[PDB]
Amino acid sequence: GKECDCSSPENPCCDAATCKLRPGAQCGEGLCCEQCKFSRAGKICRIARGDMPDDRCTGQSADCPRYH
């Protein structure tokens, strides 16, 4: 399992020394992370349009996955 919470050294919400969060924030960066914290569940991170449905964050995830 990797150990990177974000992907930026100048990010204060992430300790480049470990690549994880530096503060007590639940996340430092992610389409589902607001204010360095996990957004609530049902966060439309990906609104896939067409013959596919949309995508909502589980409220505990930081970034946003896809349908498959």
Side-chain angles (χ1 to χ4, degrees), residues 6-23 28-29 36:
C6 334
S7 41
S8 201
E10 211 200 71
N11 173 359
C13 265
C14 237
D15 218 279
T18 158
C19 209
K20 272 240 195 84
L21 280 153
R22 155 162 221 270
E29 76 102 347
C36 283

Side-chain angles (χ1 to χ4, degrees), residues 12-66:
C13 265
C14 237
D15 218 279
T18 158
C19 209
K20 272 240 195 84
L21 280 153
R22 155 162 221 270
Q26 249 83 289
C27 38
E29 76 102 347
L31 269 154
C32 310
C33 188
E34 34 174 322
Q35 254 256 213
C36 283
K37 278 257 198 119
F38 283 133
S39 309
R40 221 138 306 257
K43 152 63 181 255
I44 181 61
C45 53
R46 256 268 92 186
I47 188 95
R49 66 233 199 155
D51 172 48
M52 290 186 179
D54 313 317
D55 242 87
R56 307 239 210 153
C57 313
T58 85
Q60 329 216 353
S61 359
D63 310 44
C64 175
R66 219 135 301 234

